[PDB]
Amino acid sequence: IANQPVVIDNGSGVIKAGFAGDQIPKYCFPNYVGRPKHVRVMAGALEGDIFIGPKAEEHRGLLSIRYPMEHGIVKDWNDMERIWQYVYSKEQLQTFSEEHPVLLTEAPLNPRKNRERAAEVFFETFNVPALFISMQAVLSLYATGRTTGVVLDSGDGVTHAVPIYEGFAMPHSIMRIDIAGRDVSRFLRLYLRKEGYDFHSSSEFEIVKAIKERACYLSINPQKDETLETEKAQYYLPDGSTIEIGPSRFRAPELLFRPDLIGEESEGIHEVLVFAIQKSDMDLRRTLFSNIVLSGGSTLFKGFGDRLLSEVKKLAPKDVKIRISAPQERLYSTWIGGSILASLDTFKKMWVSKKEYEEDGARSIHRKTF
Amino acid sequence: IANQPVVIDNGSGVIKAGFAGDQIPKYCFPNYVGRPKHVRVMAGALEGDIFIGPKAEEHRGLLSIRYPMEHGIVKDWNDMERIWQYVYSKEQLQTFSEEHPVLLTEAPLNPRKNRERAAEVFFETFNVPALFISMQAVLSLYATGRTTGVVLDSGDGVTHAVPIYEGFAMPHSIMRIDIAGRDVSRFLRLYLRKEGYDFHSSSEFEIVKAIKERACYLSINPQKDETLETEKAQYYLPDGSTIEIGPSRFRAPELLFRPDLIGEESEGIHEVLVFAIQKSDMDLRRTLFSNIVLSGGSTLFKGFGDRLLSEVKKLAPKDVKIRISAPQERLYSTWIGGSILASLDTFKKMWVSKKEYEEDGARSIHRKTF
Amino acid sequence: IANQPVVIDNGSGVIKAGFAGDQIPKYCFPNYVGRPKHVRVMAGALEGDIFIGPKAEEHRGLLSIRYPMEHGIVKDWNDMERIWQYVYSKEQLQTFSEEHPVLLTEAPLNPRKNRERAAEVFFETFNVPALFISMQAVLSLYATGRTTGVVLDSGDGVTHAVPIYEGFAMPHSIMRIDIAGRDVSRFLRLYLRKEGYDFHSSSEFEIVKAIKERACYLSINPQKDETLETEKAQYYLPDGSTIEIGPSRFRAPELLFRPDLIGEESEGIHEVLVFAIQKSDMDLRRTLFSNIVLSGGSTLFKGFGDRLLSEVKKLAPKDVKIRISAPQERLYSTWIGGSILASLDTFKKMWVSKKEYEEDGARSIHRKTF
Amino acid sequence: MADPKYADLPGIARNEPDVY
């Protein structure tokens, strides 16, 4: 039973889905399970009471949105099961879980208990013939067509750097922080309360993400922007009310480089990228500096790569050629590589079959991933 | 026992009744109990001494009229029991109370003691098999065919704006004010005494309602009409004596928008419509502005809808699509939706049965309405 | 110029005033401006046309009251200028603003624009020699004499919990809600209308506060109190008409614990207290649990601290010593600590002088507070 | 002490019992 396998790029913010050997993921929607805040009195209302995908994006104001997945660590399993059931349902894919093998994605250095429970869901609740969990950094390199390179990515949950050299991922040189898009949006929300405009509700949180996506830019010199007075640019909400954002728009994404602002003494994106290159072997460092691949959502800030370069120029050894490559399709780079990995003939050897899982269990899944 | 159920659209000014699945209510009559002032010396007179419906409208001058219901809250319960008995009697419906289920209507945010006392009357004095109390806003949307939209209504009793988005009524955004048609008619009478043509008797009060219905208009700019001098247009009374109305015609319905004139600091219709939309969540506000439904008799003033839009343009955020829709039969809006709701098969599940009331009591009625 | 400084404890509900180095504030009055509704035909009336303090409390019925501050955020700046002028005037303090340094108070995480405009008022309109702004939690701990303490406060506007440990206020562990005494009083008013007794005017609103202050208690188990039938206790108005309160007395303060009753998903008082201790560092949690201090007026409900213990026992880790402390003088705890802070010799270093304000501006005030 | 509002018999604090 070797049908066209399904690639599901998991993540805290957004969940991409689709079939192998496609150019772009056709089925992208945000990873959350909205449930209604108000009491349905009238008949002919929205049926079901559990809303995932575009219906949730259309009817945000009704639904109390809550995310099941934080920092690449699923908290609520019942919600993730309903999301994966929605992916496979007739509203999106129009296929059965029994036909196709699955390609799953997870962030590196996650809990092994979550990986085991992920496999239990796909093998037992859904009746998948073969599952395969893989890393995001390896898939991003598949999408670019490279073999060498450090992979700085920044989704909604996790920011991590994986140094890989000619198809050799170094697990001990991996760095990781739990400071990413969601924490930047949460830090922006807190700053807008200091400005004046509060967005306390859970549906109203999605407005802060929309402000962060559109109206934010990373300044090169933060001390110079702090001394100067801002212009206070405007932004229109979904209602119509105007909002002067002020200095919060540039100070909000600075969380990624300075994680002491939120109150969590970590490295930062630029330090993680240097640390990953430093922890790797001496002869590989110069090739790892030249090949740096960007990915995820929080790399799409304005002047992000300019600041990332300037930070590497500050930290790294002098007279060394830095190159921070960035594709066009940075959000879908992790999915595209999965679709490429799925299409290859080697894919049949990498996966965990259903029969193999029934015999061994979790140990076979831990062996095949690494 | 599932007979063709009775709809009783309750109201302070007018009461409308009939059966389920009918196009228009056949039995529309005013909600009051006229009792004779004068002594009956001569034989062959009007018998009964308690007049309801067309007999009371025909013989106004004899009868000391008194309304049992003020602001959707019955004070005189004995009179409402006599009205409901008159509805069921051979003079109007020609049916038994024991056969048919009842669809009663009440305004939102009323006293719960009146709701229990309403149920006691229908279950014990009349022997109803099943009763159901509903809201005026939900029924108006059933009549139109929509699910979305704010329902601004203004009868003789209450003015209230209930925001409902896709069959989800929000109970904490329901605005209400006791400033409706009866208070406008009372304010018109007080103005006509200032003009010269005073009225005092209860039969004579209904002439002021007839003046309010016919010869009144809401100006767009009230300050401009105040500076200009009126023409003093005429109106002929039921007797024959002419009355030059003057500025009392246009300043009377201004009470609905300016409740400071009668001497009671409340919101007003236009503020209630905006406040109900503003109390809801951010994403639903623009859809609630696009769908505004008018209802009741006190929305039928000349230039009322034009003034409502001007007030919404003033208060609401700029560059938003405003649309104040309405039915053709604005007085029969709530009844038609009830007749639709009654004829649905789900109506059997919604109601409070007689057996369920005898077991539980008031708690089961408070569990089923809201 | 170092005279005996003034301690203005701001707040939406009540404004306390007086001099430094005192046991209790001499000048306590509610924070609102009263202006007359009606016309003054007869001479020898109450002069001024603006009523603040005991005159406004005495003559409520005339005055259309309006609160300048909502949730520790002054909306009407002209009204607060009149109140602060009234505080300084001969009717209360009997002193000039030019002599004494000022100690101002604000809730944490407020708009910075309001803090700037507050400083502008005290430096420009009034001619203050030196101003200093402080937090509620730091002042509450000064009054008790502690350094370690989580300060769960609950005023009229804001509820929050700042976790301080040995003179180290953690700014990122601060949890805040805009649900407090005013919203509970507004929620009680809505229930009383559902019971039967309607209140609408601003003078009439303060009766609901007086009912909330007197006859309200927090049930230890709300589901048990729901299933049981209440006793329906009485209360006498200034009019003399009796009011059966019923279940609304115990259900009103449930807004503090369940903020889903008003229809606005927040954390709640008990969750804010736990979340503030959880957001702080690992080793500080057990000391923060042991030192939980209470303050503000909405902590004075009957069985509030008993229920707040039970909620902490439910949420927090098992076998940990919980101690919710609460002084005799909870209402004036914030003022007492300000008077103690003002009396100390370090106070001269912390403040912002008028000369320093004229040179730098708003930036110097933002630097000195944090 | 002097002033309008006080609470009589709440106690200063509510504490859980200390185990060994």
PDB file of C-alpha atoms in Angstrom, chain B residues 41 67 301 319:
ATOM      1  CA  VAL B  41     -80.219  53.973  34.000  1.00  0.00           C
ATOM      2  CA  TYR B  67     -53.516  49.993  30.464  1.00  0.00           C
ATOM      3  CA  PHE B 301     -42.247  58.703  12.519  1.00  0.00           C
ATOM      4  CA  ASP B 319     -15.721  54.841   6.742  1.00  0.00           C
TER       5      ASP B 319
END
